């Protein structure tokens, strides 16, 4: 038994380990209709229940479909990966030319992951330059947890209908701030 218009479960962030930590219905944005007639109460109920709908649509539109709310670890595929462009370097010196000049008596002054592209500072005694193209991304994609920008997309407030209706093994235990899903038991020395 429940209101068909329940308050959403806001989800909170543990920025450090990068994953969410619980939920608890929003007790901050509630209205106070306890001094309103039967019609204003209905319009308030309607405003409340429009919210719920927006929240469901938002979730469908943005949140990644998961089999488990608040996973303990996110696969590399689902985490936003920063992929910068390849970094080009313009090599200043000529390796052979400065060896030849130095041996002459001239006293100068002033796995395969690379690309020696010739462009055919500079130096007068040789016209040879060389670009160098390097990958600037990580060696391996990062799996870890999710960041701030991605969090506000994945974890929208979740409307909870008929909240605790039988099957204690089916309750959303991710809503508990100190629930360890791996061992599936609330922990804490406290």
């Amino acid at each position: 038994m429940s209101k068909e218009i329940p308050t959403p479960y806001m989800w909170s962030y543990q920025p450090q380990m990068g994953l969410a930590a619980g939920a608890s219905q929003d007790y901050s944005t509630r209205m106070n209709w306890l001094s309103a007639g039967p019609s204003m109460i209905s319009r308030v109920n309607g405003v409340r229940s429009h919210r719920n709908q927006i929240l469901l649509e938002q979730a469908a539109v943005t949140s990644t479909p998961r089999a488990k709310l608040n996973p303990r670890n996110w696969p590399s595929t689902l985490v936003y990966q920063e992929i910068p462009g390849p970094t080009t370097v313009l090599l200043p010196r000529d390796a052979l030319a400065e060896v030849r000049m130095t041996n002459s008596g001239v006293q100068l002054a002033g796995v395969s992951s690379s690309i020696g592209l010739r462009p055919d500072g500079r130096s007068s005694f040789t016209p040879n330059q060389a670009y160098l193209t390097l990958q600037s991304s990580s060696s391996e994609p990062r799996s870890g947890g999710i960041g701030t920008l991605q969090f506000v997309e994945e974890f929208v407030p979740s409307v909870y209908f008929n909240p605790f209706s039988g099957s204690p093994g089916l309750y959303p235990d991710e809503f508990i701030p100190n629930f360890d899903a791996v061992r599936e038991a609330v922990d804490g020395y406290d």
Binding site: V111, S112, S113, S114, I115, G116, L117, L132
Partner: peptide, 30 residues
């Protein structure tokens, strides 16, 4: 040209003697 440049790696014989994975920066008084 698009030749690929590897690293020189002071040689112990024919092998370039690269080395192991020692990019460790953990001190941690604990």
């Amino acid at each position: 040209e698009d030749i690929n440049f590897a690293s020189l790696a002071p040689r112990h014989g024919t092998r370039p003697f690269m080395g192991t994975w020692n990019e460790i920066g953990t001190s941690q008084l604990n």
